[PDB]
Short mmCIF file of C-alpha atoms in Angstrom, two decimals:
data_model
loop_
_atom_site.label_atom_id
_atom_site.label_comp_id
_atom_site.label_asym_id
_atom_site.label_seq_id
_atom_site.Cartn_x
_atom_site.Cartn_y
_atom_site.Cartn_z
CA UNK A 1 -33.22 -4.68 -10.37
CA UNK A 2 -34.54 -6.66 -12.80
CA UNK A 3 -37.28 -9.72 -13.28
CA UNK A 4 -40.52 -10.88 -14.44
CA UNK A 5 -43.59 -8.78 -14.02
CA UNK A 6 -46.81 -9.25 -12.82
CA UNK A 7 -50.26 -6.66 -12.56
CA UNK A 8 -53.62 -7.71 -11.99
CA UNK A 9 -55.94 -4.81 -11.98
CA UNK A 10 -60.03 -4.36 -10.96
CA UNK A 11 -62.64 -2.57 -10.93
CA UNK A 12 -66.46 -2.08 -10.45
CA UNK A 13 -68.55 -2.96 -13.41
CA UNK A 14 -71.98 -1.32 -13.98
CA UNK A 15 -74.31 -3.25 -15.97
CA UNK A 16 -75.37 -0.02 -18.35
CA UNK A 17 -78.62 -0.83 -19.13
CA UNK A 18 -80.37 2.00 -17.95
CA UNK A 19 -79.26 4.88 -20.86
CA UNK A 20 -78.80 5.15 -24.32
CA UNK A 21 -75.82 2.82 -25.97
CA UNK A 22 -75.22 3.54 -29.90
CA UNK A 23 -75.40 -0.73 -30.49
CA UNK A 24 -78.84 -2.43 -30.79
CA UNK A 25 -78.41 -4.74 -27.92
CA UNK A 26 -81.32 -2.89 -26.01
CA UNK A 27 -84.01 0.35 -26.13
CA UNK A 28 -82.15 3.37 -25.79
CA UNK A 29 -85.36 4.69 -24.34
CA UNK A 30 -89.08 4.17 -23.89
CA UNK A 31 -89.25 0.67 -22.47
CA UNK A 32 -92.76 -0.16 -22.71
CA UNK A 33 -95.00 -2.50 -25.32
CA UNK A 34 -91.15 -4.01 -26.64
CA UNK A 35 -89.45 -7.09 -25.77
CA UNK A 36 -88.90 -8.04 -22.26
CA UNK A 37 -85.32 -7.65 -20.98
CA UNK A 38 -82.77 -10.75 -20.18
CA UNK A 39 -81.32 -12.13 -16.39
CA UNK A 40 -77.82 -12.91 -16.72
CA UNK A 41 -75.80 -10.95 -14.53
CA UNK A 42 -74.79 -13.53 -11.39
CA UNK A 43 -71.66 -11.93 -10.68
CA UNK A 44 -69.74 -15.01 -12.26
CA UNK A 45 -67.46 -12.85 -14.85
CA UNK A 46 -67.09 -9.54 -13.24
CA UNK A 47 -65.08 -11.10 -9.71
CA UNK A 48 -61.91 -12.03 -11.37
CA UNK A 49 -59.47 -9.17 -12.37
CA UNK A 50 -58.14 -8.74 -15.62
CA UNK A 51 -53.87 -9.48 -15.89
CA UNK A 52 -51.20 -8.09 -17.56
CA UNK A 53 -48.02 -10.09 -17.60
CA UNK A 54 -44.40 -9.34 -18.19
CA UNK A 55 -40.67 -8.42 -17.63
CA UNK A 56 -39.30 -5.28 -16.37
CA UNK A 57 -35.91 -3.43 -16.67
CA UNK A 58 -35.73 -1.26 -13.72
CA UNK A 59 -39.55 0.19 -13.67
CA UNK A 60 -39.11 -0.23 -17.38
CA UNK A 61 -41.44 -2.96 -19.16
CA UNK A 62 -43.58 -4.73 -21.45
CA UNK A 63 -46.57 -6.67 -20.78
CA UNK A 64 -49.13 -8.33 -22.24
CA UNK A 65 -53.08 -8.04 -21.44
CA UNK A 66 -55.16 -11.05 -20.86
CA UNK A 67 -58.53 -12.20 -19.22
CA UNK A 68 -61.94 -11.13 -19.82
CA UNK A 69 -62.82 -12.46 -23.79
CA UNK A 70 -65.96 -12.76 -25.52
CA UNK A 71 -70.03 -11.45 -25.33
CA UNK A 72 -70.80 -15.37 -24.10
CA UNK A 73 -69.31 -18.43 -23.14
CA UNK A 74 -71.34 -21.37 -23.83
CA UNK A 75 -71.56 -22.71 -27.18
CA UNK A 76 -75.16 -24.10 -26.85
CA UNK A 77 -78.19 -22.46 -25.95
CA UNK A 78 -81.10 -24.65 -25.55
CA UNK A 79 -82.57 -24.27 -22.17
CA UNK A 80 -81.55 -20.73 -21.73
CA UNK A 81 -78.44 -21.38 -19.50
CA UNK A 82 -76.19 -17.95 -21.48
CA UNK A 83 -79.29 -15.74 -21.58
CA UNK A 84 -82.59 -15.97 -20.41
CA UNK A 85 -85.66 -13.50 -19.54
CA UNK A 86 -86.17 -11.64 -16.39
CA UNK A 87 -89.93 -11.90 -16.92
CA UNK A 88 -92.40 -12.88 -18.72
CA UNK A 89 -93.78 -10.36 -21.60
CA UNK A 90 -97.27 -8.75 -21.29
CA UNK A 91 -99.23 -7.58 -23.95
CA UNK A 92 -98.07 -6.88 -27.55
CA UNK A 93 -94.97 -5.58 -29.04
CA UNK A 94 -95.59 -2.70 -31.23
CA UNK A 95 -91.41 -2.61 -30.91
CA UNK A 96 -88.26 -5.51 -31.47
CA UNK A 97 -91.41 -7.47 -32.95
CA UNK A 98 -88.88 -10.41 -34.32
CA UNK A 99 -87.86 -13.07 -31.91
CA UNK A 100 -85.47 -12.21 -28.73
CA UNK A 101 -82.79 -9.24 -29.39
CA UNK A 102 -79.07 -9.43 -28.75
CA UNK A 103 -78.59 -11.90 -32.10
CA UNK A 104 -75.13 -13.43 -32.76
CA UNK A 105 -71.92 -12.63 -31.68
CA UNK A 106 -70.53 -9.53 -33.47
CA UNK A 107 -67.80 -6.90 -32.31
CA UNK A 108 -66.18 -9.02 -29.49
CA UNK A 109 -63.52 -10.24 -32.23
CA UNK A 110 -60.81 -7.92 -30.50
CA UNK A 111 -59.27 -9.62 -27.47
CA UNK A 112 -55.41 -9.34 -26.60
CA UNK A 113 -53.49 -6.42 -26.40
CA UNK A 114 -49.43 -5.00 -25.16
CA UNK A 115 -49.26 -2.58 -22.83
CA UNK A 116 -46.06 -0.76 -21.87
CA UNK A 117 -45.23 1.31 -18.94
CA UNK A 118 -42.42 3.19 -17.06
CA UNK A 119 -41.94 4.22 -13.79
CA UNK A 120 -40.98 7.52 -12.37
CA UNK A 121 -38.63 5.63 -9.99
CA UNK A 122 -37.12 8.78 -7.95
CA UNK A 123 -39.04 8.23 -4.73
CA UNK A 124 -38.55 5.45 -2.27
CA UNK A 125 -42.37 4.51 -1.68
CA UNK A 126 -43.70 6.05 -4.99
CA UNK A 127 -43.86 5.92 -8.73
CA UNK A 128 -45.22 8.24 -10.64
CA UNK A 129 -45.81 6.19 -14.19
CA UNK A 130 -46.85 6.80 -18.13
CA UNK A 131 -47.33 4.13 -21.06
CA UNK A 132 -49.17 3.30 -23.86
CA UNK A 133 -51.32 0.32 -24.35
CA UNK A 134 -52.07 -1.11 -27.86
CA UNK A 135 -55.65 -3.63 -28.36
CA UNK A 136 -56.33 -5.96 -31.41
CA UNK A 137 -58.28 -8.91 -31.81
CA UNK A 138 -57.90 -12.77 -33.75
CA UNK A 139 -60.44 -13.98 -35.72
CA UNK A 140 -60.39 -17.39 -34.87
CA UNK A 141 -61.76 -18.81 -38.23
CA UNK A 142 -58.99 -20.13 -39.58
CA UNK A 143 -60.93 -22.37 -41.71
CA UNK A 144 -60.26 -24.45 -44.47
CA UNK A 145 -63.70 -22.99 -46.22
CA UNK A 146 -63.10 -20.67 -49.06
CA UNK A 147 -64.34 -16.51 -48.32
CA UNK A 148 -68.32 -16.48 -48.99
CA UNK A 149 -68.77 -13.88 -51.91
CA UNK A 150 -71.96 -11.74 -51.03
CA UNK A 151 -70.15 -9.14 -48.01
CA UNK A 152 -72.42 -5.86 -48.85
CA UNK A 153 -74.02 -5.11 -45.66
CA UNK A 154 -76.27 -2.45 -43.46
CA UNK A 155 -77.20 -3.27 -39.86
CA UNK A 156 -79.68 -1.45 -37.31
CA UNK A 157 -78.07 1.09 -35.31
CA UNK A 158 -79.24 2.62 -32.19
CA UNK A 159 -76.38 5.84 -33.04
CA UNK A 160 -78.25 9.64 -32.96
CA UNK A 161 -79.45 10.45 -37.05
CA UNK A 162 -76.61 12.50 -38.03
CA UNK A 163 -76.65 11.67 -41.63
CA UNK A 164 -80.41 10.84 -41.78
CA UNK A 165 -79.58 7.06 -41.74
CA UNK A 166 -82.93 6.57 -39.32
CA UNK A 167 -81.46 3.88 -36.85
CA UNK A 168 -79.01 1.88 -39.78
CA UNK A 169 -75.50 2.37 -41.46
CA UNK A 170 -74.43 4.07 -43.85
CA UNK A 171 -73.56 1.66 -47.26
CA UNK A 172 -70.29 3.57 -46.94
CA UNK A 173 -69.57 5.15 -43.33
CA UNK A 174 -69.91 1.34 -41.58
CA UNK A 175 -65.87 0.79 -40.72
CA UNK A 176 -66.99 -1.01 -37.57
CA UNK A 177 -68.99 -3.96 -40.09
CA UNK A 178 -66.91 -3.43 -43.60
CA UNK A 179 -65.98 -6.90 -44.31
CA UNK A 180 -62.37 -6.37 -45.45
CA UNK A 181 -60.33 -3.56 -43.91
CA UNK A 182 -62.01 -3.41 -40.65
CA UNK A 183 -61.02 -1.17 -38.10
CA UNK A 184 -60.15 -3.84 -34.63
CA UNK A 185 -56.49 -2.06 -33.27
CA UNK A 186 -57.44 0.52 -30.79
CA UNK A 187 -54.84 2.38 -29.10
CA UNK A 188 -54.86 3.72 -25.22
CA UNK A 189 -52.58 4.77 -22.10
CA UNK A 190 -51.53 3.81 -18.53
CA UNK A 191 -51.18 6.65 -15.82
CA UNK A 192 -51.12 6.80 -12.53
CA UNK A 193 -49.45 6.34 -9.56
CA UNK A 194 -48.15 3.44 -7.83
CA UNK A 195 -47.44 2.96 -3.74
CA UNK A 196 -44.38 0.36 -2.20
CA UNK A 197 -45.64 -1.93 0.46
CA UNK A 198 -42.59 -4.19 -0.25
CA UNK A 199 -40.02 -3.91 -2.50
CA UNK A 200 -41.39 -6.62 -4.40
CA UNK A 201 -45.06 -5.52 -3.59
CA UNK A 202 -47.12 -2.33 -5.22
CA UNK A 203 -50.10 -1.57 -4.76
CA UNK A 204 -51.39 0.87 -7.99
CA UNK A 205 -54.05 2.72 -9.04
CA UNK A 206 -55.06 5.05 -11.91
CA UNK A 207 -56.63 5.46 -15.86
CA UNK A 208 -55.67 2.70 -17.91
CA UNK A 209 -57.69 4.20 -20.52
CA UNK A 210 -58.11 2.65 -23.73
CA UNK A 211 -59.82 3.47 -27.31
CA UNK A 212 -61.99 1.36 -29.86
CA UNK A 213 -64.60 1.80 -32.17
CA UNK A 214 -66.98 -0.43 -31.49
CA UNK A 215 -66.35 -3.31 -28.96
CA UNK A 216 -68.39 -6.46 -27.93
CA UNK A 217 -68.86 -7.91 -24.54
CA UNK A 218 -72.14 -7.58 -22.45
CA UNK A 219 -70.98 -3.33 -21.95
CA UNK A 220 -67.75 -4.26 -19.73
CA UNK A 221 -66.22 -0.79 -19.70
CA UNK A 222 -63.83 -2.32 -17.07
CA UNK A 223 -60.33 -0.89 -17.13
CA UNK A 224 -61.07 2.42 -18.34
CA UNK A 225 -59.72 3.07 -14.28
CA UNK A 226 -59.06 0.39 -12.07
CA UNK A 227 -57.37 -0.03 -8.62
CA UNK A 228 -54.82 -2.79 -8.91
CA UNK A 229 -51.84 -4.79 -6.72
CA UNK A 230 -48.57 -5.14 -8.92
CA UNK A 231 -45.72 -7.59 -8.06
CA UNK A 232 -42.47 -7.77 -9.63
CA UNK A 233 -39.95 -10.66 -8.79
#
């Protein structure tokens, strides 16, 4: 046959807090005589699944990826409604001295993708299935305010010392913060196998693997595998 597509795919998300993560969001280890750590996690934006939506050719199809965007939602701050502590600090910091940690939005600028997928269609209650899924992002500024001139930059950086950088950038290997020429497509795949509960009804699990440099979000690494239902009319 032929008609529009639908997949809606989920997954469990672990929160990731407890082991060492190359951004400087939080300790990689050593918790103690630091800042204290944030509540936030109330299951609100880890219980919807993510959607890809399309039209297929006979198990043949493109798609396009939505849900799940941003680090944050709210756009104001005040009585610490996005992020707020899980308890009270004691004693002194003799580490993450300034302020609260986590500051600004940065890296969560890549948020739509494609993905594309055909099935193995030689079974009657199985496909078999391969395709390639392609990420990028929209800065959404798109202002009428002419580029700011000063753009050289080094950050902190929780990454292992390879190059003796002792917890920063590079001035030259920084690809993920370079202010023109910015790396933001990543590039993944879609494997698996899917089961026929009606003709119009799948249900379809598998990798749906994908690959960035560094990514914003809150450590979603949702949709790496998921277990998904898949309807096509």
């Amino acid at each position: 046959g032929r008609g529009p597509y639908v997949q809606a795919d989920l997954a469990y998300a672990y929160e990731h807090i407890t082991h060492d993560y190359p951004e400087p969001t939080a300790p990689n280890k050593n918790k103690i005589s630091t800042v204290s750590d944030y509540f936030r996690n109330i299951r609100t934006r880890s219980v919807h699944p993510r959607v890809s939506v399309g039209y297929d050719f006979g198990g043949w199809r493109i798609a396009a990826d939505y849900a799940r965007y941003r680090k944050w939602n709210n756009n104001k701050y005040s009585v610490n409604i996005e992020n707020v502590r899980i308890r009270k600090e004691n004693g002194i910091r003799i580490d993450r001295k300034t302020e609260n940690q986590e500051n600004g939005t940065f890296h969560a600028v890549s948020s739509l993708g494609l993905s594309a997928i055909y099935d193995f269609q030689i079974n009657d209650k199985f496909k078999p299935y391969i395709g390639a899924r392609v990420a990028y992002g929209h800065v959404r500024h798109s202002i009428d305010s002419t580029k700011k001139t000063i753009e050289v930059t080094t950050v902190p950086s929780n990454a292992p010392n390879g190059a003796v950088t002792t917890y920063n950038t590079d001035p030259k290997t920084q690809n993920d913060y370079q202010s023109n020429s910015i790396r933001r497509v990543g590039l993944g795949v879609i494997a698996g196998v899917g089961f026929d509960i009606t003709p119009k009804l799948t249900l379809d699990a598998g990798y749906r693997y994908h690959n960035w440099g560094r990514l914003e979000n809150t450590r979603f690494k949702t949709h790496e595998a998921s277990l998904g239902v898949r309807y096509r009319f």
